[PDB]
Amino acid sequence: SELDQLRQEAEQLKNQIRDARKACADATLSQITNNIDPVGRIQMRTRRTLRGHLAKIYAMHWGTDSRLLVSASQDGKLIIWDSYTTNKVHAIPLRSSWVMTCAYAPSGNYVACGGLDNICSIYNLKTREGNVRVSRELAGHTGYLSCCRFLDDNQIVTSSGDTTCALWDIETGQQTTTFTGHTGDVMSLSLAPDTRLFVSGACDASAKLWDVREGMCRQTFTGHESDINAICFFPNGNAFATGSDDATCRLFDLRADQELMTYSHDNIICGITSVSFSKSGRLLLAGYDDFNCNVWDALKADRAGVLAGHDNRVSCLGVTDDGMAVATGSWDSFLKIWN
Amino acid sequence: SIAQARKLVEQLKMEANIDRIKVSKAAADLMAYCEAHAKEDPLLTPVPASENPFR
Amino acid sequence: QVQLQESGGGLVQPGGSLRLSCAASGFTFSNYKMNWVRQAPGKGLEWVSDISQSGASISYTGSVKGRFTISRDNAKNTLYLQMNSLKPEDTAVYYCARCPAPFTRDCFDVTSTTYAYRGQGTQVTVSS
Amino acid sequence: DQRNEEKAQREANKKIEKQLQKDKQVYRATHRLLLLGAGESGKNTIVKQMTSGIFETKFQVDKVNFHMFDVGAQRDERRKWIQCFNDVTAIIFVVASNRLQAALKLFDSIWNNKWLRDTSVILFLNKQDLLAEKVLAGKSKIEDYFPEFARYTTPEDATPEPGEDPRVTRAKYFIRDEFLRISTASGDGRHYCYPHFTCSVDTENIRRVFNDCRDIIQRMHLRQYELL
Amino acid sequence: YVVGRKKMMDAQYKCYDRYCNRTWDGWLCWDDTPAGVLSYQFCPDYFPDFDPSEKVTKYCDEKGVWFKHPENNRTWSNYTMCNAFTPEKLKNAYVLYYLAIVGHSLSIFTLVISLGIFVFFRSLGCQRVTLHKNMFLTYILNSMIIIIHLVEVVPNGELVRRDPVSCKILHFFHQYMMACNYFWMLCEGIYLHTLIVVAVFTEKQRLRWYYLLGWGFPLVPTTIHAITRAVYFNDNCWLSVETHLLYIIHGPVMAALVVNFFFLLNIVRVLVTKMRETHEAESHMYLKAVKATMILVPLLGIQFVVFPWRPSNKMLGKIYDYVMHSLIHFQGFFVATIYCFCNNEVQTTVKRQWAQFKIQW
Amino acid sequence: XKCNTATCATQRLAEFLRHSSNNFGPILPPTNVGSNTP
């Protein structure tokens, strides 16, 4: 069996990698943050309740100016809100009514969407004529789209259900580099602050850090018991947090290349749907299937508060660029802004 | 599925020769960043009224 | 990183009793449903049996109810499949599968062609 | 400048509200259906009679709008994209008549899924012609795969369709109770299953899904008032 | 007293204007009567004690002359019936009035709590919740008006002596609210029948005709009745119930309640057929059908149709009176409890709000 | 005519109370129905 001998030597390197990771873990983060004073109880009330969507909200993305946001639901409707005054700006009908993602360009000119059509539809908001229409339909993915994020007006990174991620070119419509290596559906991704790198969490209970330019996976992070539903980079850009179905939120380190902390409770048994950090990274906000959002101290693993205002499970959570507010959209077609 | 087992060998070798820093400084950097931006963070320290636009 | 390497199997005479022990690591075993799946030569994946988290609810495929018995031990996180009264028809490679989510009754994609939480099967041969 | 900017914003919001309300009437009028099969189970015939990962099909029956969505080219793993179909009226399950055993496992995993607890499953036992000729020819057998069939007896309430073999009548109903065994074992009443012995050539499958959809709505309305 | 004097003087004048020869006792006068029979007519209302509903008896002897009491050898009629049954009826009526006040007060309390729950919570809102809110508001208004009437207008002799326009308009509003309640019951029954029986599919309802029938339509019987009451049978504060013109308002109400009864029967038949389509236990099926009918009776006002009239037996008549005044006056409380307190989703949302509040504090 | 209907139950009771009770005062001796009166 010439195939078997390859596995025997391959697992030795995996064993060697395991030994290296444990050697670098001289001391855990719990002892290094034992003397830090706790943040204490925090009160956060829903300042605004954005309503108007018909079907369940599946994703949302804050604007780069901390004012507008785009929310996509399962009725084929894209709504752009104004969080300050709660007035809709646009209502874009969708070709396919089974989208699971949306995005806001850093220039505020484009909005993308994708879902159970393997096609990432991109709309332009600053058209010369006046009405919002699809500018370019990016096709080439095999599985359903799960999360698409913008780099600039000419580049976009999309993660599909065919265990691959892509880096598209807007004008040409052809993907430049295709990222391979995942064994299961890719559910979420988050760009680094410098945009050089990005990680993606798939259904293999593993997160893989990719390189945007050369299209090669540098490091692989594992340790989760079940699949990963959402992921988010640390504000510093040298860490990220993953939300999984097995009801654990984990914090990883790029430089350490291993686990740092786990956020879990015996009471909590449902999976995590969305994870995001705060402005300073001290506060971690995680969504759950029990209709509640739990606020986790990212340095002490102790819950600081609970954001419970939704009648159904949350499927999207996002914190503004300046950290002034957090918007959590749930399956009850309601978006709430907490402050 | 046959080639995925053959191509995993060179994928795993490349991820094994990288350099890793000690966790002690890795966690210290995380603590330092959190304290440096603690004042700016409005969610951490509640901003007073007449400042946030959601009042 | 979950990985399930199971022992047992190999060439055996018809009717020769064998046991298939599944070793589990990387995840807690007390709250995950377990399954057994075979791959007939020249055919797709087939489902054999499953056991609940508590080990009470046991279900089998049509052709193995009177031949196979299964057990699960949580103390040593090992899953066992017992073979009795084998025939040349059922020869295949047996994979020890795992249920994608905990604290749930449904189980999806166990017999799927590409499954992340599935071990490397051991080929068993029953012939004379 | 606060007064000038707000004036245009209100008109846009009011105009969008009018357009959104109009589309809300249409969305609530149509009934969404999910056509799902066991893989090469003959479901292609149902969609035809009436690039892209989901095919959209709309047909008009008795002044009622229906919307059947068939998922094509998506990966076999349905554990992630099946949570979207938790607001559809029903799932039109098509089961080929091994392939039979794998059909039951997917149906069991759909019935017990937390999201698709409420959603009802319309079940079609298509490809009955091959099943009818399988027993008559004797080349292929099912009691070897399903040992309960030898001891199984024809149900008393079964209606004999004239011109059919009484032996194959037992085989057809045996699959129905095998699918109904899981449906009634873990059925809390929030959802139901409607087995149907359909063919690959009859055009009456449209009428069957029309009556079954009305049955679901009648039960849903009754339990909204706590009558049932 | 003087009013009673005028009534019998009026009656004597009418008799004066109008085998035993007919004899006017002094209070009533009979018609031609043959020998050997007992005559009956309604008891007059000259005195406050006299009960109009009772029957006065008069016997003509077989010899062709009226009876003379042996002790005084003078004509006397058996008027004992009116005063025989009066004190017991008064005690029963006092008990019934107290029960009505208590039941109405509890009904307003429970219904205002139910309205607060249905209004403050926006998640439960749907098409049937609007109809429930209209039901509860109408019930509260009718109960408050009835309590005010029974507490203030009925006891005060002067207001019915002063003949004020305000009392007349208050009683007109009372009748209007009663008609609105008994027609909103029919509206709810029609909504149930449309949702379940005839139009199953989720087609959006038009709640304009529903509001019209609930509120605007009950005005027509009230005005039509008031016009003919003023022209024909003008009375003191229109409080009199002796007239047959109250059927102008009580006819359409009865027709609506009969239609509601038919709708309930059809919905029960549909539910029974549906539960028969699935192989279910007979005892559980019968229990479910009985429970469905029991919880649908208060909503559709079926108790009015099922018990249309009263019997003549004293004990069974007391049973009927007590049952009717325990069902009618507590119907609002029963409806509010069944459709807001026993409701499933309302309980779940209340517990969720309580848990969220406890987590917050 | 009377009402003699379930929907008219409350009005009949209130009218009977109004006509019988002497402004909810103390009970008065019953009107004589003996041989003395007609």
mmCIF file of N, CA and C in Angstrom, chain A residues 3 6-7 9-10 13-14 17 24 26-27 29 32 36 39 47-48 83-84 216-220 234-236 253 255-258 278-282 299 322-325 337 339, chain B residues 2 4-9 11-16 18-31 33-35 37-38 40-44 46-47 51-55:
data_model
loop_
_atom_site.group_PDB
_atom_site.id
_atom_site.type_symbol
_atom_site.label_atom_id
_atom_site.label_comp_id
_atom_site.label_asym_id
_atom_site.label_seq_id
_atom_site.Cartn_x
_atom_site.Cartn_y
_atom_site.Cartn_z
ATOM 1 N N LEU A 3 -0.152 4.213 -0.549
ATOM 2 C CA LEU A 3 -0.862 5.337 0.050
ATOM 3 C C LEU A 3 -0.664 5.376 1.561
ATOM 4 N N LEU A 6 2.546 7.178 2.997
ATOM 5 C CA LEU A 6 2.483 8.636 3.005
ATOM 6 C C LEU A 6 1.814 9.152 4.273
ATOM 7 N N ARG A 7 0.769 8.463 4.738
ATOM 8 C CA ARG A 7 0.068 8.899 5.942
ATOM 9 C C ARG A 7 0.950 8.771 7.179
ATOM 10 N N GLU A 9 4.244 9.045 7.544
ATOM 11 C CA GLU A 9 5.200 10.141 7.655
ATOM 12 C C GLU A 9 4.509 11.492 7.788
ATOM 13 N N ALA A 10 3.326 11.649 7.187
ATOM 14 C CA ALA A 10 2.602 12.912 7.297
ATOM 15 C C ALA A 10 2.167 13.181 8.732
ATOM 16 N N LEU A 13 4.917 14.624 11.090
ATOM 17 C CA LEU A 13 5.058 16.075 11.036
ATOM 18 C C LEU A 13 3.935 16.762 11.801
ATOM 19 N N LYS A 14 2.713 16.235 11.695
ATOM 20 C CA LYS A 14 1.608 16.759 12.489
ATOM 21 C C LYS A 14 1.873 16.571 13.978
ATOM 22 N N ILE A 17 4.443 19.135 14.827
ATOM 23 C CA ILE A 17 3.805 20.439 14.985
ATOM 24 C C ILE A 17 3.140 20.541 16.352
ATOM 25 N N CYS A 24 5.835 26.078 23.143
ATOM 26 C CA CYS A 24 5.726 27.531 23.202
ATOM 27 C C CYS A 24 4.737 28.000 24.261
ATOM 28 N N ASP A 26 4.392 28.254 27.448
ATOM 29 C CA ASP A 26 5.041 28.243 28.756
ATOM 30 C C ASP A 26 4.050 28.563 29.869
ATOM 31 N N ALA A 27 3.135 29.499 29.626
ATOM 32 C CA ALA A 27 2.124 29.864 30.607
ATOM 33 C C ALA A 27 0.876 30.333 29.877
ATOM 34 N N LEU A 29 -2.869 32.334 29.354
ATOM 35 C CA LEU A 29 -3.269 33.727 29.498
ATOM 36 C C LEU A 29 -4.024 33.989 30.796
ATOM 37 N N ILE A 32 -1.543 35.313 33.349
ATOM 38 C CA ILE A 32 -0.964 36.595 32.965
ATOM 39 C C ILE A 32 -1.960 37.738 33.123
ATOM 40 N N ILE A 36 -5.430 41.729 36.639
ATOM 41 C CA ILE A 36 -6.142 42.811 35.971
ATOM 42 C C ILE A 36 -7.518 42.982 36.600
ATOM 43 N N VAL A 39 -13.795 44.379 34.432
ATOM 44 C CA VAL A 39 -14.558 45.493 33.885
ATOM 45 C C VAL A 39 -15.852 45.723 34.656
ATOM 46 N N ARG A 47 -30.996 51.259 21.820
ATOM 47 C CA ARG A 47 -31.336 52.648 21.533
ATOM 48 C C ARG A 47 -32.327 52.761 20.380
ATOM 49 N N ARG A 48 -32.124 51.989 19.315
ATOM 50 C CA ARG A 48 -32.994 52.017 18.150
ATOM 51 C C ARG A 48 -33.377 50.597 17.763
ATOM 52 N N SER A 83 -28.689 54.594 10.877
ATOM 53 C CA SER A 83 -28.848 54.218 12.279
ATOM 54 C C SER A 83 -29.191 55.413 13.155
ATOM 55 N N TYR A 84 -28.769 56.612 12.757
ATOM 56 C CA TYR A 84 -28.981 57.783 13.601
ATOM 57 C C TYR A 84 -30.455 58.174 13.647
ATOM 58 N N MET A 216 -1.846 31.525 -0.629
ATOM 59 C CA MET A 216 -1.374 30.314 0.028
ATOM 60 C C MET A 216 -1.678 30.400 1.515
ATOM 61 N N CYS A 217 -2.100 29.282 2.100
ATOM 62 C CA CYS A 217 -2.426 29.231 3.523
ATOM 63 C C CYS A 217 -1.136 29.118 4.324
ATOM 64 N N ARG A 218 -0.924 30.054 5.251
ATOM 65 C CA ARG A 218 0.317 30.068 6.018
ATOM 66 C C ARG A 218 0.224 29.179 7.253
ATOM 67 N N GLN A 219 -0.802 29.378 8.077
ATOM 68 C CA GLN A 219 -0.959 28.619 9.309
ATOM 69 C C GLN A 219 -2.383 28.094 9.411
ATOM 70 N N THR A 220 -2.532 26.972 10.111
ATOM 71 C CA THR A 220 -3.824 26.346 10.351
ATOM 72 C C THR A 220 -4.072 26.273 11.849
ATOM 73 N N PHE A 234 -9.137 40.313 15.698
ATOM 74 C CA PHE A 234 -8.896 41.254 16.777
ATOM 75 C C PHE A 234 -8.560 42.628 16.198
ATOM 76 N N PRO A 235 -8.920 43.707 16.899
ATOM 77 C CA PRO A 235 -8.552 45.046 16.408
ATOM 78 C C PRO A 235 -7.059 45.225 16.199
ATOM 79 N N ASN A 236 -6.227 44.600 17.035
ATOM 80 C CA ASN A 236 -4.783 44.675 16.849
ATOM 81 C C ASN A 236 -4.334 43.994 15.563
ATOM 82 N N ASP A 253 -4.096 33.124 18.415
ATOM 83 C CA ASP A 253 -3.029 34.088 18.183
ATOM 84 C C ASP A 253 -2.252 33.675 16.943
ATOM 85 N N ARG A 255 0.784 34.860 15.943
ATOM 86 C CA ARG A 255 2.199 34.664 16.247
ATOM 87 C C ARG A 255 2.417 33.425 17.108
ATOM 88 N N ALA A 256 1.554 33.205 18.103
ATOM 89 C CA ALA A 256 1.675 32.018 18.939
ATOM 90 C C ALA A 256 1.242 30.753 18.211
ATOM 91 N N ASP A 257 0.364 30.878 17.213
ATOM 92 C CA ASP A 257 -0.080 29.751 16.389
ATOM 93 C C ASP A 257 -0.716 28.649 17.233
ATOM 94 N N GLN A 258 -1.468 29.043 18.257
ATOM 95 C CA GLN A 258 -2.152 28.080 19.109
ATOM 96 C C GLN A 258 -3.254 28.792 19.882
ATOM 97 N N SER A 278 -14.740 44.588 20.396
ATOM 98 C CA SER A 278 -15.021 45.982 20.691
ATOM 99 C C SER A 278 -13.934 46.862 20.077
ATOM 100 N N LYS A 279 -13.987 48.162 20.375
ATOM 101 C CA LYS A 279 -13.003 49.089 19.823
ATOM 102 C C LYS A 279 -11.602 48.778 20.336
ATOM 103 N N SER A 280 -11.468 48.548 21.639
ATOM 104 C CA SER A 280 -10.178 48.260 22.248
ATOM 105 C C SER A 280 -9.862 46.773 22.305
ATOM 106 N N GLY A 281 -10.813 45.912 21.950
ATOM 107 C CA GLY A 281 -10.607 44.482 22.009
ATOM 108 C C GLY A 281 -10.754 43.870 23.384
ATOM 109 N N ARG A 282 -11.036 44.674 24.410
ATOM 110 C CA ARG A 282 -11.229 44.131 25.750
ATOM 111 C C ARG A 282 -12.568 43.419 25.876
ATOM 112 N N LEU A 299 -10.179 39.220 28.028
ATOM 113 C CA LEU A 299 -8.935 39.016 28.754
ATOM 114 C C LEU A 299 -9.082 38.173 30.013
ATOM 115 N N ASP A 322 -15.943 53.071 15.065
ATOM 116 C CA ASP A 322 -15.559 53.806 16.263
ATOM 117 C C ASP A 322 -16.051 53.157 17.550
ATOM 118 N N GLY A 323 -16.807 52.065 17.459
ATOM 119 C CA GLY A 323 -17.257 51.360 18.640
ATOM 120 C C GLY A 323 -18.379 52.025 19.401
ATOM 121 N N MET A 324 -19.062 53.000 18.796
ATOM 122 C CA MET A 324 -20.116 53.714 19.509
ATOM 123 C C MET A 324 -21.329 52.831 19.774
ATOM 124 N N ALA A 325 -21.611 51.874 18.893
ATOM 125 C CA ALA A 325 -22.793 51.040 19.045
ATOM 126 C C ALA A 325 -22.559 49.695 18.374
ATOM 127 N N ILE A 337 -30.086 48.312 17.822
ATOM 128 C CA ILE A 337 -28.824 49.009 18.047
ATOM 129 C C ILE A 337 -28.647 49.185 19.547
ATOM 130 N N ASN A 339 -26.172 50.392 22.880
ATOM 131 C CA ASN A 339 -25.161 51.383 23.228
ATOM 132 C C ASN A 339 -24.905 51.401 24.731
ATOM 133 N N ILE B 2 -8.385 10.968 -4.024
ATOM 134 C CA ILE B 2 -7.062 10.364 -3.950
ATOM 135 C C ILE B 2 -5.963 11.411 -3.818
ATOM 136 N N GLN B 4 -5.953 14.446 -2.686
ATOM 137 C CA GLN B 4 -5.940 15.308 -1.505
ATOM 138 C C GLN B 4 -5.028 14.756 -0.416
ATOM 139 N N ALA B 5 -4.847 13.435 -0.366
ATOM 140 C CA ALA B 5 -3.919 12.856 0.598
ATOM 141 C C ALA B 5 -2.471 13.052 0.171
ATOM 142 N N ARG B 6 -2.208 13.045 -1.138
ATOM 143 C CA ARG B 6 -0.843 13.220 -1.622
ATOM 144 C C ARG B 6 -0.387 14.668 -1.489
ATOM 145 N N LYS B 7 -1.274 15.620 -1.779
ATOM 146 C CA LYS B 7 -0.920 17.032 -1.727
ATOM 147 C C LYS B 7 -0.901 17.594 -0.311
ATOM 148 N N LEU B 8 -1.382 16.838 0.677
ATOM 149 C CA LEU B 8 -1.371 17.329 2.052
ATOM 150 C C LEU B 8 0.027 17.273 2.657
ATOM 151 N N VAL B 9 0.904 16.425 2.113
ATOM 152 C CA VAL B 9 2.237 16.255 2.688
ATOM 153 C C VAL B 9 3.043 17.543 2.566
ATOM 154 N N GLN B 11 1.804 20.497 1.939
ATOM 155 C CA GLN B 11 1.084 21.542 2.657
ATOM 156 C C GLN B 11 1.441 21.540 4.138
ATOM 157 N N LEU B 12 1.563 20.352 4.736
ATOM 158 C CA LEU B 12 1.878 20.258 6.157
ATOM 159 C C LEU B 12 3.334 20.595 6.448
ATOM 160 N N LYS B 13 4.248 20.267 5.529
ATOM 161 C CA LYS B 13 5.657 20.585 5.744
ATOM 162 C C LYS B 13 5.882 22.089 5.809
ATOM 163 N N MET B 14 5.204 22.846 4.944
ATOM 164 C CA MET B 14 5.405 24.291 4.906
ATOM 165 C C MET B 14 4.906 24.952 6.188
ATOM 166 N N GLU B 15 3.821 24.438 6.760
ATOM 167 C CA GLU B 15 3.268 24.973 7.997
ATOM 168 C C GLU B 15 4.020 24.507 9.236
ATOM 169 N N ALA B 16 5.071 23.704 9.075
ATOM 170 C CA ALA B 16 5.826 23.181 10.205
ATOM 171 C C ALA B 16 7.148 23.898 10.437
ATOM 172 N N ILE B 18 7.710 27.167 10.108
ATOM 173 C CA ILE B 18 7.526 28.577 10.439
ATOM 174 C C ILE B 18 8.047 28.836 11.845
ATOM 175 N N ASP B 19 8.230 30.108 12.187
ATOM 176 C CA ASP B 19 8.746 30.505 13.489
ATOM 177 C C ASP B 19 7.603 30.951 14.391
ATOM 178 N N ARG B 20 7.649 30.515 15.647
ATOM 179 C CA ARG B 20 6.624 30.830 16.632
ATOM 180 C C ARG B 20 7.250 31.572 17.805
ATOM 181 N N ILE B 21 6.573 32.622 18.258
ATOM 182 C CA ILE B 21 7.030 33.391 19.405
ATOM 183 C C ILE B 21 6.442 32.789 20.676
ATOM 184 N N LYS B 22 7.047 33.132 21.810
ATOM 185 C CA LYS B 22 6.564 32.635 23.091
ATOM 186 C C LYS B 22 5.202 33.235 23.415
ATOM 187 N N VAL B 23 4.356 32.436 24.069
ATOM 188 C CA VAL B 23 3.021 32.899 24.433
ATOM 189 C C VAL B 23 3.098 34.007 25.478
ATOM 190 N N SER B 24 4.131 33.989 26.325
ATOM 191 C CA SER B 24 4.237 34.970 27.403
ATOM 192 C C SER B 24 4.262 36.393 26.859
ATOM 193 N N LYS B 25 5.068 36.642 25.824
ATOM 194 C CA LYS B 25 5.043 37.955 25.190
ATOM 195 C C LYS B 25 3.827 38.124 24.289
ATOM 196 N N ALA B 26 3.322 37.029 23.716
ATOM 197 C CA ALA B 26 2.134 37.113 22.873
ATOM 198 C C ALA B 26 0.919 37.568 23.673
ATOM 199 N N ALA B 27 0.750 37.034 24.885
ATOM 200 C CA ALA B 27 -0.351 37.465 25.738
ATOM 201 C C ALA B 27 -0.102 38.843 26.335
ATOM 202 N N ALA B 28 1.162 39.192 26.587
ATOM 203 C CA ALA B 28 1.476 40.523 27.095
ATOM 204 C C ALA B 28 1.133 41.599 26.072
ATOM 205 N N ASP B 29 1.390 41.327 24.790
ATOM 206 C CA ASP B 29 1.028 42.279 23.744
ATOM 207 C C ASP B 29 -0.481 42.474 23.680
ATOM 208 N N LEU B 30 -1.245 41.394 23.853
ATOM 209 C CA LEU B 30 -2.699 41.510 23.889
ATOM 210 C C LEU B 30 -3.152 42.358 25.070
ATOM 211 N N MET B 31 -2.524 42.170 26.233
ATOM 212 C CA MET B 31 -2.862 42.978 27.400
ATOM 213 C C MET B 31 -2.476 44.438 27.197
ATOM 214 N N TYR B 33 -2.240 46.183 24.355
ATOM 215 C CA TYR B 33 -3.138 46.855 23.418
ATOM 216 C C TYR B 33 -4.478 47.171 24.067
ATOM 217 N N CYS B 34 -4.990 46.254 24.891
ATOM 218 C CA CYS B 34 -6.283 46.469 25.533
ATOM 219 C C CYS B 34 -6.243 47.670 26.471
ATOM 220 N N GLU B 35 -5.152 47.822 27.223
ATOM 221 C CA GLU B 35 -5.025 48.949 28.138
ATOM 222 C C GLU B 35 -4.742 50.254 27.404
ATOM 223 N N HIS B 37 -5.857 51.323 24.472
ATOM 224 C CA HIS B 37 -7.070 51.860 23.871
ATOM 225 C C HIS B 37 -8.273 51.776 24.804
ATOM 226 N N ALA B 38 -8.044 51.518 26.094
ATOM 227 C CA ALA B 38 -9.154 51.414 27.036
ATOM 228 C C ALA B 38 -9.903 52.735 27.162
ATOM 229 N N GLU B 40 -10.182 55.165 24.916
ATOM 230 C CA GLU B 40 -10.917 55.497 23.699
ATOM 231 C C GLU B 40 -12.208 54.693 23.588
ATOM 232 N N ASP B 41 -12.177 53.422 23.994
ATOM 233 C CA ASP B 41 -13.315 52.515 23.882
ATOM 234 C C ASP B 41 -14.531 53.066 24.619
ATOM 235 N N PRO B 42 -15.619 53.377 23.909
ATOM 236 C CA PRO B 42 -16.814 53.899 24.584
ATOM 237 C C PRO B 42 -17.683 52.801 25.176
ATOM 238 N N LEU B 43 -17.635 51.605 24.588
ATOM 239 C CA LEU B 43 -18.391 50.485 25.140
ATOM 240 C C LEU B 43 -17.807 50.015 26.465
ATOM 241 N N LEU B 44 -16.485 50.092 26.621
ATOM 242 C CA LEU B 44 -15.856 49.705 27.879
ATOM 243 C C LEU B 44 -16.196 50.697 28.984
ATOM 244 N N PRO B 46 -18.492 53.740 29.858
ATOM 245 C CA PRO B 46 -19.682 54.405 29.304
ATOM 246 C C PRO B 46 -19.475 55.886 29.032
ATOM 247 N N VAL B 47 -19.630 56.281 27.774
ATOM 248 C CA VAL B 47 -19.514 57.696 27.405
ATOM 249 C C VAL B 47 -20.677 58.466 28.024
ATOM 250 N N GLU B 51 -23.050 63.120 23.915
ATOM 251 C CA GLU B 51 -21.893 62.759 23.106
ATOM 252 C C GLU B 51 -22.228 61.717 22.052
ATOM 253 N N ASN B 52 -22.899 60.633 22.434
ATOM 254 C CA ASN B 52 -23.309 59.643 21.456
ATOM 255 C C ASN B 52 -24.503 60.151 20.646
ATOM 256 N N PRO B 53 -24.570 59.805 19.361
ATOM 257 C CA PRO B 53 -25.682 60.256 18.513
ATOM 258 C C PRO B 53 -26.960 59.443 18.647
ATOM 259 N N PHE B 54 -26.989 58.432 19.514
ATOM 260 C CA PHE B 54 -28.173 57.609 19.720
ATOM 261 C C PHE B 54 -28.965 58.023 20.953
ATOM 262 N N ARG B 55 -28.625 59.150 21.572
ATOM 263 C CA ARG B 55 -29.342 59.612 22.756
ATOM 264 C C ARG B 55 -30.747 60.087 22.398
#
